Write a protein that binds this ligand. Structure first.
Ligand SMILES: *CCOCCOc1cc(C(F)(F)F)cc(C(F)(F)F)c1
Ligand SMILES: [Zn+2]
Length: 256
């Protein structure tokens, strides 16, 4: 699978029938139809910088992984009674500054999107186990808006030089992902899935109501990464965002 016409989101249903499922992400969040939930508690994130492990070029994108051995970096509050263990964060972007996000609000596309992923360490003992469980994954979605350069992104962007080509790996240590999150943690939440194969419908989404900035040049650095392996012809990762999906009667709750 990929993001080209030959193997893109339109072709995913071939090898991943769940793509045409009822709990698929991303989706369009219509604020007028979001339901405020009294039971929702504030989102609480406590990450340990020492947890940061490495950064990897995976052809279609890049993953910044963390040590998920213990509960040093966890996610609490929200719709969760359980505690979720951070393991990775990554980005999604488009070929132009205008429409590169995955989630949309009131039909409004953003430039990019940050995903901070966690797995249910209260019920399960591994990401592999939790990945296919409805209550296995919790992902924070932060919408990124084109504008002034984001200084918080620089340490990540500076590391992309060591993972230029597909398969390249590099140590990525001493970093707190929460520094990338917006000032406020007000959020929408809805039962969703992974935005790319395997497309497991096992994700409880936490979409921040507040967005963060990113310069056009910083977005250019994302597309600067190569989807090809070393030595081969350079093929930049121009985009890796999935179109919004049918909400299928799902309810998007609001904490505000
Ligand atoms: C590319 C780095 O690999 C580390 C783990 O990869 C996974 C990431 C995700 C994520 F939620 F981030 F999209 C999901 C999965 C899984 F669902 F388990 F396949 C693996
Ligand atoms: Zn994602």
């Amino acid at each position: 699978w990929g993001y080209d016409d030959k193997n893109g989101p339109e072709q995913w249903s071939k090898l991943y029938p769940i793509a045409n499922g009822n709990n698929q992400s991303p989706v369009d969040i219509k604020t007028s139809e979001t339901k405020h939930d009294t039971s929702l508690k504030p989102i609480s994130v406590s990450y340990n910088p020492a947890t940061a492990k490495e950064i990897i070029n995976v052809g279609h994108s890049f993953h910044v992984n963390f040590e998920d051995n213990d509960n040093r970096s966890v996610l609490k509050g929200g719709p969760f009674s359980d505690s979720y263990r951070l393991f990775q964060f990554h980005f999604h972007w488009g070929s132009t500054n205008e429409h590169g996000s995955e989630h949309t609000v009131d039909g409004v596309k953003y430039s990019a999107e940050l995903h901070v992923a966690h797995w249910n360490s209260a019920k399960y003992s591994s990401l592999a186990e939790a990945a296919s469980k409805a209550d296995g994954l919790a992902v924070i979605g932060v919408l990124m808006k084109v504008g002034e350069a984001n200084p918080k992104l620089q340490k990540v962007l500076d590391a992309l030089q060591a993972i230029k080509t597909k398969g390249k790996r590099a140590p990525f240590t001493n970093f707190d992902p929460s520094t990338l999150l917006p000032s406020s943690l007000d959020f929408w939440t809805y039962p969703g899935s992974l935005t790319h194969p395997p497309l497991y419908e096992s994700v409880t989404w936490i979409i921040c109501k507040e967005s963060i900035s990113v310069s056009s040049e910083q977005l250019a650095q994302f597309r600067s990464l190569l989807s090809n392996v070393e030595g081969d012809n350079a093929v930049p990762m121009q985009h890796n965002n999935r179109p919004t999906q049918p909400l299928k009667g799902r309810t998007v709750r609001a904490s505000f």
